[PDB]
Symmetry: D2
Subunit: 448 residues, 4 copies
């Protein structure tokens, strides 16, 4: 076996022996830590089977004179340039260790208050919440599987964000999770913005499929999908949304459900949907889905900017003084939006299985915010069925997840999902044809 | 009230509403937070080391406000000596945020006992940013009297200057005298040496901070929960120790480290200890050296040396020991900044609450293991400090007279003469008020 | 007028009144117009390779103001593409100060030793020679007018240089002058290399045609073409050369003629010619041109790497500790190569007119170094005639520059310039068809 | 020889061969000997004549252009530059400041304009002129030979300045050139002012006598005394003057002579004379000397604050907004006061000898500015005659420097100089009694 030593991290705190003992190869905690560290070294598909290709990989944590040193057994050779691990990948290994450790030390210490304080704590522990920072963070969302035209577009938006001294917070992995940071690197250099921040959020059951690029200079591993959604919207000062598949619709329905709450009517966070000229049909269909399901009231919470990278960035840049003023109006923090009201329906972690998917309430007779929360979960289930080990396994055992609801809505969701399949948004190129993991059915007398 | 706003200062993270909710003025915690904050503002020579301090600033209050760039502080009627031309000294501003950080962290961490204690001490120091993972060893703990004459003060300043010239940092208590002289010297030596990354760490705890407030020159103030945890923080962070003449607080510290260093499991620990003072302190040191060898045995002498009238040689012993310190931490697979492998037995950690009963119950006999006798003498000196300068201590004395101790008649007489010397040398209390009255009486 | 104030941006020292007097519009001196035109060019980056820049912005001016925190600049009617949302890009602001610093320096300070000492003085005063730096500067040369496939390959080589913590030194303008720096911004980001240096060197008679991208973070204005060439080769630790036109040809001949000097036999500076797969035929012909003219002895001084960006960057990276050893063996500086022997024929400033062009010694029958120095001139003549204002008017006055020599050399020559013309290397595309400024008999 | 290598320290640029070739040791090189002697003084930082050389006859220094710039080889350096066998870093930086500035002045080898521009050029090359910095620099002047009460007082003043985020620019050497910076090191640390600047200005013929302390973080070597004076007053945003001897008197006359020029009536820079309680008589007598000689008009240009270290610092701090507004009004730099009028009488370098001291115009019937210029030169000669090698030689071979002028003036000067001798300001303690290097001597009939 090839054994490689990773020297201590710039800025990783000393750990105690109690903090790290749960990580020995011995609880499934080691396997989870190993699997996240493997994903960071393996930064070329979304169906987990490279976790059969690195079976002999393992990682050992050593407490030493300057803090933690890591020993890697048989690491991916693509983490190397000229025999050395890329420094940004080195920093990600330490980020993985830090967050796994932190969460495991605070699994002990209402529940809605608990979840928000836990999200705040993880982010604060990661160094992601800079107290003195003026608002400038744009969350970017978009598909992992996008064409070259969409990809170049996300790169040019990132350039435009860079020229305006804005920072980027996004998911991890290929497609729209990687383009803007590459564009921002150039626009930040032109503008001499050396304090740039490219935050990449992930969680343990999706990191292998959507692994962090080395350019991400603040990686944070959140415990689950809902906590990462809540981290995105409490840190965001503005949000740009590119074309994407089910994961990107999920995010859109999460934020629109929150923003329709009357207590959030004065939250100024700008939301811009944007894409190249060729995405015009895609946005017409999305805009129509949203206002047909959630009503015409949802329209006030976002705008659409087609084929104009500088417009999206300018709308974000121009809103930063509005964000500043609103935070001071609420006696809130610039770096973490505590005053944003997030109802428990957006926090409750959702575990996609046949029963939970069939339990979803997709009828028109609810508050729109609540229909949004249920649609968020439906799209979360399609993602899971497609890419999470445990969700793919449910689909293997029992076939597709079945959903039902108002027939008009179900038809519209079924068409949206078929469009995602026709636009190749479900699967990166070069597997076999995509087989849907979902089936829309009509809602179903006793024997006596 | 005259409201003074204090902007965020130093490295202060955002806090949650839960973290600060008890620091509202309603709350025992608020009063503790308030007292520690007043102490850091009232940092000039009020001589007073008797906690009748507060009564001067009864209308003081502080409000913690969570705002856009983190916490701002609103002070109602702060002491004027915290000000230069109507602005608060920046070092005092940072100390207000250190107090808040440390009060908050300890309060959030209420949930085996020996392991819990050492892990708490580490956690507090880590939270304070006092444990730098990549730093090479260079931290010298300095101990010595809070009430010392000008010749002794000058000498501590010369040692600080020699530590500064050698790129050493200083960790010490708070308050005046030997807690401040060395950092003033070291400011000059470090500037000559261009050592802009100097660290002047000042450790305190809530029941002694009003009596011994941190100089604004301290650039890393840390509030520990109590005296024993401060002791543990000192000796786990130390790479070497310098001890100047002092009174009962300095005896307490010397006995603590000797008791620990005498444990057979610590035989390989390389940390050097140098007792040093000016030429005039020769008799003080002969008498102290004799008290240690007479009580703990000739074996204690192998853990320190004595350097009179030679500031450079004290600093040189520290500097020369650093490579052995490094090697030994590497041999132990231990951290440079926090000595986990040092064995500290429970009798060194168990918090001692001095009152007439606990002082009377101290086991003071010459037939004990010397490390165990050092633990009991540590507790006796801690009790003399508490009776002299702590609020609660000073009260027990007022309402019942001196603390009484008893034990081996031979030990009791040597102890009695040392305490008596501390009184004759003016080490028991800062001068400028009424003559010291013993808070102790040795019975038989 | 639109009037825009520029606050002090760089590491710009205080100046005296004496130092800026000649920049007043009232001074009887040509210096204001030079300073104005260099300042215009930096505000005109991204658009354009003809100096008829001047006609669209006739009403532009710039005023230097010595104030409390040093120099403030006032711009009257600046190009509006230097702006993002009403504000001049910060990199452009710093360039305006770099232009000021170097114009002032050269004006205050103004033979082999004198020339090299001047080049060193200029660089040192610009902050470009960092005394404590370990060798890692790669000079990149290549065509300002290139296709997408060549451009994308230059960005990939840049990304590979970034991942290996190498810095870039290059000319100014579009194409190969800007591609590597874009790639390196991403490779340096992955590698957390925050101290990156993107040096762009230029001179006043080409700056309007080839202006610096805002990404260049160390702009230096040299006084003339030959001093920029000398600056390149004394700072370089390695050299990467992409496909180019006559400007890249000129640079290649300059450095080959110097490296062939017996005194330079132990100068370790790696030279790597590189390009995408499609450039295979370009390089086969460039390779044959060099060896047919300078002889087989030139070949030991460069290699060719096609279709492999990582390889070019790995050769630069692997040579750095060689460069460190050789500088110490010569008791020389890391950051400025004094020990490099540059013969006066490579320093002597060449003024391209029909005469000096005709009086060039292009016989296939000289010292190889001495013929390289002559071809270097010829190529610089073809550049000047294409882009420099004074050159261009010599051609509008007397037609094409005429060159003659050994008919074996002259065929080779002509076919090379003809290949440049057909590969779209002479002129950025989309104006009046390129008509040659040269004629060969 | 014992050869100790010094690596690069501070912000020194690469130098060319041309720049350093004249610094090579040869039989005839006057420039090498000057460089060697300035370097040796920085390494030797306890009497005050320049026969301190003699202990270190075998010292030499070699400049070597190498990969990361210049490396220095010292032969037989003094032992007090070292702590535990390594050279104190501030001293290492000083060796390079000495090299930097000697090379610069030699490479830069109209007249009034010329001198001012050279002064600026030297300071800018040394990095002493920070373009973006808000005004905060206080020049401190004061005696090199002072008792413990006066020294502790200077230290208390430096602490107050430190607490106010003010910087210090001073001469080099012991006494009042040393105390304020030790006091400010403490004050600035309490205030977290890590960007502190302690500027020590010196010149080749005095640096041996008054060697810079390692705590100086910006050492600058000016070409001569007059250019150091111009450097002080152009960089100053305020001035504090402690009690001192003839060198301190020379500085006060220089600044008063300048500040009385009609073109300087708008200049806002404050001047505070200050010292401990026991210096009341000293300041009474100094203030009377000033107003008797230069006139009642001179009094408006300074104030006196006895026994109050915080007040002297407060005056400096409260004058900053005015100094900033006045610089902006004159379209001048914060860091270099070009607007200040300095007449040639203050710039012309003065070479003290028996003939130039006898040619001094010390008559009360002339412009008070030119009287001040002339008195400035006279104290300068007493300084030369006591501490400068060359001056000391003039006195060894020809006896004291004679001066004459108005008997009204001559008497005041005589008394003042007498007061300096009796207050032990001429000579640091140790050897024998001070012997005066001056004599004050006694046109009509027609």
């Amino acid at each position: 076996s090839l054994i490689i030593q990773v020297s201590p991290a710039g800025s990783m705190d000393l750990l105690s022996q109690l903090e790290v003992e749960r990580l020995k190869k011995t609880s499934d905690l080691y396997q989870l830590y190993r699997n996240c560290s493997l994903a960071v070294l393996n930064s070329t598909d979304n169906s987990k089977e490279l976790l059969d290709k690195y079976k002999n990989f393992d990682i050992t944590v050593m407490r030493r004179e300057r803090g933690i040193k890591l020993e890697l057994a048989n690491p991916p050779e693509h983490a190397f340039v000229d025999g050395q691990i890329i420094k940004g990948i080195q920093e990600h290994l330490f980020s993985v260790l830090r967050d796994i450790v932190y969460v495991n030390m605070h699994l002990a210490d209402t529940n809605a208050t608990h979840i928000t304080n836990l999200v705040f704590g993880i982010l604060r522990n990661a160094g992601a919440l800079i107290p003195g920072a003026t608002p400038n963070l744009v969350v970017c969302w978009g598909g992992h599987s996008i064409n070259e035209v969409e990809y170049q577009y996300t790169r040019e938006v990132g350039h435009e964000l860079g020229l305006r001294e804005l920072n980027i917070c996004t998911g991890c992995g290929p497609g729209a999770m990687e383009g803007p940071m590459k564009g921002a690197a150039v626009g930040h250099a032109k503008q001499r913005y050396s304090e740039y921040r490219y935050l990449g959020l992930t969680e343990p059951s999706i990191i292998a499929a959507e692994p962090p690029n080395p350019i991400v200079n603040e990686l944070v591993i959140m415990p689950d999908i809902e906590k990462r959604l809540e981290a995105f919207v409490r840190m965001a000062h503005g949000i740009i949304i590119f074309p994407g598949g089910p994961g990107t619709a999920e995010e859109l329905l999460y934020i629109l459900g929150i923003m329709m709450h009357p207590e959030n009517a004065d939250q100024p966070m700008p939301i811009v949907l944007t894409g190249p000229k060729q995405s015009e049909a895609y946005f017409r269909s999305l805009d129509k889905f949203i206002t047909d399901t959630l009503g015409e009231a949802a329209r006030k919470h976002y705008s659409i900017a087609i084929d104009n990278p500088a417009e999206a960035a300018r709308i974000m840049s121009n809103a930063m003084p509005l964000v500043r003023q609103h935070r001071k109006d609420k006696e809130d923090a610039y770096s973490f939006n505590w005053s944003l009201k997030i109802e428990p329906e957006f926090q409750l972690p959702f575990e996609p299985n046949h029963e939970s998917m069939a339990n979803l309430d997709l009828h028109l007779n609810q508050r729109p915010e609540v229909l949004a929360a249920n649609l968020r979960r439906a799209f979360s289930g399609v993602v899971a069925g497609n890419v999470k080990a445990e969700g793919i396994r449910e689909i293997e055992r029992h076939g597709p997840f079945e959903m039902h609801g108002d027939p008009v809505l179900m038809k519209k969701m079924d068409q949206l999902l078929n469009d995602f399949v026709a636009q190749n948004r479900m699967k990166l190129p070069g597997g076999s044809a995509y087989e849907p993991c979902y089936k829309i059915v009509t809602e179903g007398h006793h024997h006596h």
